[PDB]
Design a protein around this ligand. Structure first.
Ligand SMILES: Nc1ncnc2c1ncn2[C@@H]1O[C@H](COP(=O)(O)OP(=O)(O)OP(=O)(O)O)[C@@H](O)[C@H]1O
Ligand SMILES: Nc1ncnc2c1ncn2[C@@H]1O[C@H](COP(=O)(O)OP(=O)(O)O)[C@@H](O)[C@H]1O
Ligand SMILES: Nc1ncnc2c1ncn2[C@@H]1O[C@H](COP(=O)(O)OP(=O)(O)O)[C@@H](O)[C@H]1O
Lengths: 717, 757, 469
């Protein structure tokens, strides 16, 4: 059973036995589909649950099959799983062909109708719209170069650059106005992709390239689609420099895309040559510079699915070996995280394993012995190992290297800011990145501080959302007073330095200690001179706070007055609850936390009219198994844990608690043992997973809230 | 006894340690003979000169003598035999010519004054002291000459000869003993023993060590060969230290056949168990340090069939690749100058480069006998060898710039002209010439007929690079021999007392004020003062604990135990080192450096107390003195931005190197002292290449000006600024305008840089 | 203190903490003056001396606390628990007896002062200072006493000879202990024991601790000094069953816990008293140390008995209660009865070289002193004829043995030489330690081996030569 459909080599042997037991249950396989695929979260089925209609993602975006596979005709689990994979590949290829036709109709046009562009974008998935954009742009530039090849010929490359420019203006207009978040992500991926295409086209026009075989064009990745090819898998060929690969045609759901940094394209070139030379790459460098992320993005662009083995105490050996042999069978990629953190004997064992597999790969340039099994290594198999300065001696001669010492932060902060519809994106990026360089150094160091590149990306996202909310509010005001509404007119007269300052305030000022606040203000004065941001007080909420403090005997004050700082902290708590579904009120014991959140809950209930119900749970007092729930060794029955119990109670909405506001205050210390299962909620997924397989979605009213005294053992994740 | 001891020991050491061991045997035989005196004073000073502390007033600044030369002169003059050294140096006129002589150790002048004639070994050691004081670059050669004087000139005459491994395997090694061949990375010693087994007509089994099946084959072959008497050979056994310990145990209780021999081809890594190193005869193989030998090795490695393919231009491309690879690899040996850190430019890079050239030239010349030089995909090769290969390991930006300079100078269509210069002014006006041949045989002949007189200019470094390398090797000699030679409690008390005396007592904190908190320079300087105060108090309390333990009034706690042990062995204490420090700096120079840092911080604290931030702006700090100097440059940036209400990103740094006396304190200008230029001389803010090892910049002025948004002139160059000589940390980059007729590519190749200290 | 982790600041925020320290000297004065008056109510003729007895006891306790600080040695802690143990000892002595003059009382008081405040001392001048302080304070508070009788130096208290716990002469005690040794040799293992005064004092100390309930004593001293042998001696002489855990490299925690369960069930169910002798060699893990800490504190460890072991333990407890005459059904009452049985019947003794300290009794065996070594020398070099008529007394004698006769005979001089050779071995090892070189601890097992080698060599060579003679 294991050899056929090797995709469940990823899932555990006990989980394999679970799948064999639940073979006559398709509704219990969703966890396994989560495990073995990239972004697939569940297969869409009809009410009969006898034919699989399509697949979905964690984000809810779903793919419909051209020819659905009837499980009744193929009762064997492996047969219809293989049919599902083959049909998902075929459907992805056909949808890609359709979308590429649509865009090449859209391309080579003087102007783009926003309605048609938005319609096409909604028609296909994020990965497919980005890939069709890339195929169309590559074919256009190749055709322009072929026309230019006459020698000193006039340039239609100017025309291609103009087409990309007008499409970019279309996207910068569209992202500005309110959109569904999924289409927002599609637009962001498309705009960053097109910014990269514009910059490479500008490089081409500056270098005055004339020949389609000139190496300057050869270096940049080229996408060739061949619709005439009978095999749908090979129709797309992605080629960079000498190397050429086929598209994996595996579903990615929706993924965070990269800005395609000069360092990122350098890494793309080095890795692509390495796999062309039939050996993996080891992009070492300090942690947090996008090494793992760059490998993931490269695998995603190829259409292949990456396994990020995080190498820490949680790292295993038997599970790693089985998922490794599965990697070898299927052909998916595998990117180890920090390797120097492994145990020395652990390190030697995995090093010998990957050395054997790599020798098999160079032999294929064909089976190798894994767990006493000969495994036909797929030629598409790739292994990457990031490091934090080295590579074991048995691997130095098998793997290339690269120093991702410093990703270009200015380019990232400019591309992402432009992706949020910001005008003057370059100025704002060149201001914000040195500011975050200042923050990581001049500020007093703390454990909870994080001025990494990811924090910068999050601040940019928050600023984009703030700008959207401001334009929505101004549109409402203009509708009330007058009727002259024009999105571009509002945007032009909309300051953006103030927006960035407000975003950085709302995200970073709360994390500051009582001394770093003047330092942050001085840094804002230095980098963004003359521009200041004053948070608009919530006067109704301030009055509710005063009344609640009177009712609770607590003290109240405004700013300088006694209790002013506590009041400000309560207001920041409210803002974070507005903009985040997960919170942590860090502070030394007896600082403000319990009283602050209680007072805010009561004032909110007395203001908005929504009842406030809190489930104060101490995580350490109860055992971890009892916190989330116990597993029956025989019947697998779910004795839902305390947190699982309260979440299920709120979900069932027996007494209208969905209308009520629910705060799950996790008073107590925090460690990376229980919070590992709760990390699946604090992300944008906002869903809880359980070891039986049933998954519960967090209702919007539920606010997960951690009242902790200190973060010496809180994971930065 | 002495000869066989050296010729059996040095056969298993690094080539640099041969002279160390020979000089140790020289000391032994000097003590063994009775006629010669003890020479305790001479050897003690020859090993402990640099520990004697001097003063600025102690240096008379004698004409024709550098500063360090003056220090060495006076330090030798402290000895009674060299008391009149200064008088003879100033009186002599022939001294100036001998000082810069090519080989001054051969004709060492008679300067030391004595009442009675000395033995030849005594004159040899006096001249050793003279060479160490004056021309330490020649100290390796002078130690060679001293050993030749003492144990005979032909004492070493064996190590130059190829290792006669036939006579060493036939006898003088027991069949139970394993033969150990520990070769440095980038080399394999398997060839020599394959030729041996061939010439002895001995059937040898060659097993590699890669996995468990390798272990099984190795054990089976050992079990067969122990009785059959044949030879067995294992490759890269450093991969399995535990299995190697097991093999040690297996062989220990195992009688072999007379003809049985066990060879373990190995790599030199500390992962090898100590027990085998003790239980087997070791042999060290190092590749010959030569550009010509490197090219020969490269061409021998590459099969002749591959290099002679359909495009006749392939041979020239392969020769250029081999030359570039040799240039990089032999630049590696000059680590501070040729690079900033030792990269692994091993054979894998060259093999991948060969494959890259092969596939690209197959692409461009689709089965054509000849292909035009302009059609050569020069940009493809340059880009790949600049980014993918030879560039992946390159992390520093400036090392990448240097690699780009080499690739653009070599890889071009211009190489295929008969007048192409692979190097320029290697000696005088002479320069190397690209061979005019088109076949591999011609290039191999040309490299074989190389002048065999490689200087640093051959591979692009200044000719003083060899002198610096020899000085480093001599200092390594001194350190190793010092390592090779209760009372330790009393001496630790004495040295701890000395350090407590020399280190400054206490450092005052800065007074916080709201206007002072606003200023960024005040914030940075108060952070620096706090760090200095905390570390100073830590070290003072640690030394107080140490000295009280020396008088017995306190007992050695575990932390105090580790601290005392580390002080005993001279290793820098971990709790004492919180700021970035050169890797090999020993505790005494660390204490001197820390004393200087606290003196500087005391000066800045006094200046701040006297005035405020406005006076704190005009303090000429030295970037080395500050614990974090890039913090200082960023503080200057923030200060000027705050004073003139500009953005930080729209500011750029301009450098105005002027005299300290002739300096202008502009509101945008900050004084920085102690900067030194490696490989160049700056006059009126103009770069000029020179052979001086280090030019002291009298006072560097850092001025912040708004971004002019104008493209930089081709005459300006970006100079990396490192804190220390190892060049592992980058502070910032300056931009200097080079003088006329100068090539920025040469500046990149000669590794010109600014050092904080 | 070790093993005590400060609680979370969140918890400290709630609970007020009040510091309960060692009572002040006046507080102790009253606290134990009440006890002393209640005790001396036994003998009315001595009731007027109760208050000055408390004053002297408090003064001595404060001197010992102020002089023997914990910094010098980890076990130099004196709590009011020691004073309570002092009063309890004086009471246990005075109970079976009906009358005593003041001198007998002060002899008992000084005996308990020696057994509590001096038995734990490592260095000898500390013991001399303790004896001097005891004599001085007995003089100050109790002036009208015959100091010769009250604090006569051989303060040896035993009950093996008399019916009661009256003082015992060291010579008569030596005769009795010799007879009991003869029985020990005849029945148990046979090795020679020479009875220096140190063995007399130490056997008395071990027996005193054994006889009391919850008896736990800390046998700290250099290896080979006789700690485990004296322990087995007192165990057999007192009826107690000696038990040491057979420990080797395989001996993990589970085997230790199984042995723990065996000894616990034997001393809590069968009402069989067991002397548990334990050594640092038997402690392969600090887990053993914490388990014994719990056993010594609570009298029983809950972590030993669970599940099937719990059921078997309760079955045994029910059977033992039925045999004894107590009828208990539930598991809790039987558990409490078994805990009482263990705490009354089990005695653990720990051999070495702030909870256990001040919750146990630490006796500093140390090494054999000059007197002991010299008695060793004579007793085992008694057989061979080390008697030379030609011997001439030297004008100067190194006099390594203080009590050597003024004319040294030949045998006395040679045994003095042997004691000197041991002393010089100690001095050489100390010098090697001072210079920092590796040293090796010189034990009396070395002395015994030296004497045995001497006997073998002397016998063999004298035999061959005399055979020629
Ligand atoms: N606005 C206020 N005015 C007056 N007293 C206040 C105010 N807010 C809190 N307090 C008091 O300060 C203390 C803080 O109580 P609370 O339980 O909220 O602390 P905490 O910071 O959550 O503590 P911990 O981290 O230990 O759980 C209480 O004594 C509370 O009465
Ligand atoms: N090419 C890129 N484009 C945009 N953001 C990036 C890029 N590379 C890294 N980042 C950001 O920097 C962070 C680095 O994360 P990670 O992949 O863990 O770095 P590393 O691989 O060095 O550990 C990411 O969270 C991401 O937000
Ligand atoms: N008073 C004594 N007379 C003779 N031998 C003794 C005496 N005390 C101890 N020994 C010897 O010491 C040896 C073992 O001592 P031991 O009790 O094991 O020391 P420890 O208990 O300190 O480890 C025994 O063989 C015994 O003969």
């Amino acid at each position: 059973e294991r050899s056929s459909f090797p995709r469940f080599y990823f899932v555990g042997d006990e989980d394999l036995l679970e799948i064999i037991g639940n073979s006559k249950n398709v509704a219990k396989l969703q966890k396994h589909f989560k495990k073995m695929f990239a972004g697939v979260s569940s297969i869409i089925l009809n009410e009969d649950n006898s034919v699989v209609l399509g697949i979905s993602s964690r984000e809810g975006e779903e793919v419909m099959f051209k020819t659905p596979v009837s499980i009744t005709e193929h009762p064997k689990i492996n047969e219809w799983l293989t049919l599902v994979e083959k049909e998902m590949r075929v459907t992805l290829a056909k949808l890609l062909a359709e979308s590429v036709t649509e865009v090449e109709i859209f391309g080579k046009a003087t102007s783009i109708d926003p309605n048609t562009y938005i319609t096409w974008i909604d028609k296909y998935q994020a990965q497919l719209v980005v890939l069709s954009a890339q195929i169309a742009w590559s074919e256009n530039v190749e055709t322009a170069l072929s026309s230019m090849g006459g020698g000193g010929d006039a340039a239609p490359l100017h025309s291609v650059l103009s087409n990309v420019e007008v499409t970019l203006n279309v996207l910068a207009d569209s992202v500005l106005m309110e959109q569904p978040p999924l289409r927002r992500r599609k637009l962001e991926h498309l705009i960053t992709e097109l910014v990269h295409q514009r910059d490479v086209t500008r490089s081409l026009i500056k270098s005055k390239i004339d020949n389609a075989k000139s190496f300057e064009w050869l270096s940049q990745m080229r996408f060739y689609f061949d619709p005439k090819q009978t095999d749908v898998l090979q129709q797309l060929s992605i080629q960079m420099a000498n190397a050429k690969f086929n598209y994996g045609f595996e579903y990615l759901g929706v993924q965070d895309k990269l800005v395609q940094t000069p360092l990122t394209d350098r890494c793309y070139l080095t890795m692509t040559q390495a796999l062309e030379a039939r050996l993996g790459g080891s992009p070492f460098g300090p942690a947090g510079t996008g090494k793992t992320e760059s490998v993931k993005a490269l695998g995603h662009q190829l259409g292949r699915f990456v396994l990020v083995f995080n190498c820490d105490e949680t790292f295993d050996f038997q599970a790693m070996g089985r998922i490794f042999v599965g990697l070898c069978q299927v052909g998916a990629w595998g990117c180890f995280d920090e390797f120097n953190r492994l145990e020395e004997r652990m390190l030697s064992a995995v090093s010998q394993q990957v050395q054997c597999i790599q020798e098999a790969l160079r032999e294929h340039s064909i089976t190798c012995e894994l767990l006493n099994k000969q495994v036909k290594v797929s030629p598409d198999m790739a292994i990457f190992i990031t490091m934090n300065p080295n590579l074991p001696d048995n691997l130095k001669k098998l793997f290339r290297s690269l120093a991702m010492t410093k990703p270009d932060r200015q380019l990232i902060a400019q591309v992402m800011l432009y992706s949020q519809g910001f005008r003057t994106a370059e100025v704002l990026a060149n201001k914000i990145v040195p500011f975050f360089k200042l923050c990581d150094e001049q500020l007093s160091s703390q454990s909870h501080y994080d001025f990494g590149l990811r924090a910068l990306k999050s601040v940019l996202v928050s600023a984009g959302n703030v700008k959207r909310e401001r334009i929505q509010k101004i549109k409402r005001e203009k509708e009330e007073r007058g009727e002259a509404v024009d999105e571009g007119e509002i945007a032009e007269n909309l300051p953006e330095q103030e927006i960035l300052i407000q975003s950085v305030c709302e995200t970073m000022v709360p994390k500051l200690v009582a001394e770093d606040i003047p330092l942050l203000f001085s840094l804002l004065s230095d980098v963004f001179p003359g521009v200041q941001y004053h948070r608009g007080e919530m006067t109704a909420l301030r009055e509710e706070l005063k009344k609640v403090c009177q009712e609770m005997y607590l003290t109240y004050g405004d700013g300088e007055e006694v209790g002013g700082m506590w009041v400000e902290k309560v207001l920041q708590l409210y803002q974070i609850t507005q903009i985040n579904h997960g919170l942590m009120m860090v502070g030394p014991s007896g600082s403000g936390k319990s009283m602050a959140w209680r007072v805010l809950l009561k004032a909110l209930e007395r203001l908005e009219g929504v009842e406030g119900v809190a489930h104060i749970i101490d995580p350490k007092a109860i055992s971890k198994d009892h916190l989330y729930g116990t597993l029956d060794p025989n019947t697998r029955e779910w004795t839902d844990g305390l947190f699982t119990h309260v979440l299920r109670k709120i979900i069932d909405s027996v007494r209208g608690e969905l209308q009520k506001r629910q705060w799950i205050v996790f008073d107590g210390d925090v460690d990376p043992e229980w919070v590992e299962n709760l990390n699946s909620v604090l992300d944008d997924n906002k869903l809880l997973t359980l070891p039986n397989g049933e998954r519960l979605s967090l209702p919007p009213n539920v606010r997960i809230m951690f009242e902790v005294q200190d973060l010496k053992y809180a994971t930065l994740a | 006894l002495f000869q066989v001891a050296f010729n059996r020991v040095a056969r298993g050491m690094l080539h640099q340690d041969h002279i160390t061991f020979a000089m140790l045997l020289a000391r032994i035989k000097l003590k063994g003979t009775v006629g010669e005196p003890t020479y305790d004073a001479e050897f003690q000073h020859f090993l402990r000169g640099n520990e004697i502390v001097l003063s600025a007033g102690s240096t008379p600044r004698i004409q024709g003598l550098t500063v360090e030369q003056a220090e060495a002169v006076v330090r030798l003059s402290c000895l009674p035999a060299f008391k009149d050294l200064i008088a003879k140096v100033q009186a002599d006129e022939q001294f100036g010519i001998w000082l810069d002589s090519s080989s001054p150790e051969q004709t060492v002048p008679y300067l030391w004054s004595e009442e009675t004639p000395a033995t030849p070994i005594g004159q040899a050691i006096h001249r050793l002291l003279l060479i160490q004081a004056f021309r330490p670059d020649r100290l390796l050669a002078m130690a060679h000459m001293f050993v030749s004087t003492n144990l005979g000139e032909s004492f070493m005459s064996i190590m130059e000869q190829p290792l006669d491994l036939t006579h060493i395997v036939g006898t003088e090694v027991k069949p139970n003993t394993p033969v150990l061949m520990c070769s440095v990375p980038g080399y394999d010693a398997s060839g020599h023993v394959e030729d041996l087994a061939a010439e002895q007509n001995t059937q040898i089994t060659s097993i590699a060590i890669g996995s468990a099946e390798g272990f099984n084959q190795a054990d089976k072959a050992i079990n067969t060969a122990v009785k059959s008497g044949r030879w067995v050979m294992l490759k890269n056994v450093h991969l399995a230290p535990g299995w190697l310990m097991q093999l040690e145990k297996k062989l220990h209780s195992l009688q072999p056949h007379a003809c049985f021999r066990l060879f373990l081809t190995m790599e030199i890594n500390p992962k090898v168990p100590v027990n085998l190193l003790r239980a087997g005869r070791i042999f060290v193989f190092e590749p010959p340090p030569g550009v010509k030998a490197n090219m020969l090795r490269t061409f021998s490695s590459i099969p002749v069939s591959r290099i002679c393919k359909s495009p006749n231009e392939r041979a020239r491309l392969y020769f250029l690749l081999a030359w570039f690879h040799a240039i990089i690899q032999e630049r590696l040996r000059y680590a501070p100058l040729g690079w900033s850190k030792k990269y692994e430019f091993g054979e894998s890079d060259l093999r991948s480069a060969c494959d890259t050239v092969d596939t690209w030239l197959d692409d461009t010349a689709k089965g054509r006998q000849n292909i035009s030089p302009d059609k050569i995909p020069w940009s493809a090769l340059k880009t790949l060898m600049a980014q993918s290969i030879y560039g992946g390991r390159v992390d520093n930006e400036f090392d990448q710039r240097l690699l780009n300079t080499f690739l653009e100078r070599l890889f071009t269509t211009r190489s295929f002209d008969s007048e192409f210069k692979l190097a320029c002014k290697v000696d005088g006006h002479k320069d190397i010439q690209m061979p005019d041949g088109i076949r591999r045989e011609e290039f191999v002949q040309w490299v074989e007929l190389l002048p065999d007189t490689q200087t640093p200019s051959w591979l692009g470094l200044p000719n003083n690079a060899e002198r610096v390398l020899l000085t480093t090797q001599g200092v390594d000699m001194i350190s190793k021999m010092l390592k090779m030679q209760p009372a330790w409690m009393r001496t630790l008390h004495t040295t701890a007392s000395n350090w407590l005396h020399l280190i400054p007592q206490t450092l005052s904190h800065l007074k916080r004020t709201v206007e002072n908190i606003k200023d960024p320079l005040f914030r940075f300087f108060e952070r620096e003062v706090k760090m200095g105060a905390k570390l100073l108090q830590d070290v003072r309390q640690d030394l107080a604990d140490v000295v009280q333990v020396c008088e017995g009034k306190k007992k050695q706690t575990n932390y105090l135990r580790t601290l005392i042990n580390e002080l005993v062995k001279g290793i820098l204490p971990r709790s004492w080192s919180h700021y970035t420090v050169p890797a090999g700096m020993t505790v005494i120079q660390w204490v001197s450096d820390f004393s200087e840092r606290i003196k500087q911080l005391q000066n800045i604290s006094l200046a701040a107390a006297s005035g405020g931030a406005k006076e704190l702006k005009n303090i000429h700090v030295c970037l080395g003195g500050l614990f974090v100097p890039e913090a200082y440059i960023t503080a200057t940036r923030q200060y000027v931005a705050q004073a003139n209400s500009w953005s930080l990103e729209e500011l750029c740094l301009e450098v105005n190197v002027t005299t300290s006396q002739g300096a202008t304190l502009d509101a945008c200008s900050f004084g920085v002292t102690g900067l030194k230029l490696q490989g160049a001389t700056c006059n009126n803010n103009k770069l000029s290449l020179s052979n001086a090892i280090s030019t002291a910049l009298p006072l560097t002025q850092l001025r912040w000006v708004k971004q002019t948004n104008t493209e930089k002139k081709a005459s300006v160059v970006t100079l990396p600024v490192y804190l220390n000589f190892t060049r592992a940390d980058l502070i910032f980059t300056v931009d200097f305008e080079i003088a006329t007729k100068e090539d920025p590519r040469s500046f990149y190749e000669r590794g010109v840089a600014v050092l904080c200290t | 203190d070790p093993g005590r982790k400060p609680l979370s600041h969140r918890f400290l925020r709630h609970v007020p903490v009040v510091y309960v320290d060692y009572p002040g000297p006046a507080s102790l004065t009253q606290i134990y003056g009440t006890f002393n008056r209640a005790m001396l109510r036994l003998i009315p003729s001595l009731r007027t001396y109760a208050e000055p007895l408390t004053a002297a006891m408090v003064e001595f306790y404060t001197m010992s606390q102020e002089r023997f600080t914990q910094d010098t040695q980890p076990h130099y802690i004196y709590s009011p628990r020691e004073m309570t143990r002092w009063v309890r000892g004086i009471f246990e002595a005075l109970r079976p007896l009906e009358t005593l003059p003041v001198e007998g009382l002060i002899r008992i008081w000084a005996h308990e002062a020696l057994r509590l405040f001096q038995d734990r001392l490592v260095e000898d001048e500390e013991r001399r200072w303790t004896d001097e302080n005891i004599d001085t304070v007995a003089l100050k508070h109790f002036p009208n006493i015959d100091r010769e009788k009250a604090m006569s130096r051989p303060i040896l208290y035993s009950n093996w000879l008399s019916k009661d716990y009256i003082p015992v002469d060291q010579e008569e005690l030596r005769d009795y202990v010799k007879a009991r040794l003869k029985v020990f040799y005849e029945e148990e293992l046979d090795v020679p024991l020479v009875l220096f005064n140190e063995v007399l004092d130490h056997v008395l100390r071990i027996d005193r601790i054994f006889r009391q309930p919850q008896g736990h004593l800390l046998l700290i001293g250099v290896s080979g000094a006789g700690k485990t042998t004296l322990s087995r001696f007192v165990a057999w002489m007192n009826g107690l069953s000696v038990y040491q855990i057979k420990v080797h490299r395989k001996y993990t925690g589970e085997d230790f816990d199984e042995d723990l369960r065996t000894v616990l069930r034997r001393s809590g169910c069968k009402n069989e008293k067991i002397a548990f002798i334990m050594d640092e060699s038997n402690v392969l893990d600090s887990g053993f140390l914490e388990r014994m800490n719990t056993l010594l504190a609570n009298g029983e460890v809950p972590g030993l008995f669970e599940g099937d072991e719990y059921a078997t333990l309760m079955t045994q407890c029910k059977e033992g209660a039925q045999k004894e005459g107590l009828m208990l059904d539930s598991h809790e009452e039987l558990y409490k009865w078994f805990t009482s049985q263990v705490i009354r019947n089990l005695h653990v003794v720990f051999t070495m070289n702030p909870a256990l300290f001040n919750r146990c009794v630490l006796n500093w065996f140390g090494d054999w002193s000059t007197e002991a070594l010299y008695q060793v020398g004579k007793e085992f070099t008694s057989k061979m004829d080390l008697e030379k008529p030609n011997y001439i007394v030297p004008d100067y004698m190194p006099v390594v043995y203080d009590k050597l006769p003024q004319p040294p005979s030949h045998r006395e001089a040679i045994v003095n030489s042997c004691v000197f050779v041991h002393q010089t071995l100690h001095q050489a090892n100390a010098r090697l330690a001072k210079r920092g070189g590796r040293t090796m601890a010189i034990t009396p097992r070395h002395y015994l081996d030296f004497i045995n080698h001497y006997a073998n060599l002397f016998h063999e060579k004298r035999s061959e030569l005399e055979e020629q003679q």
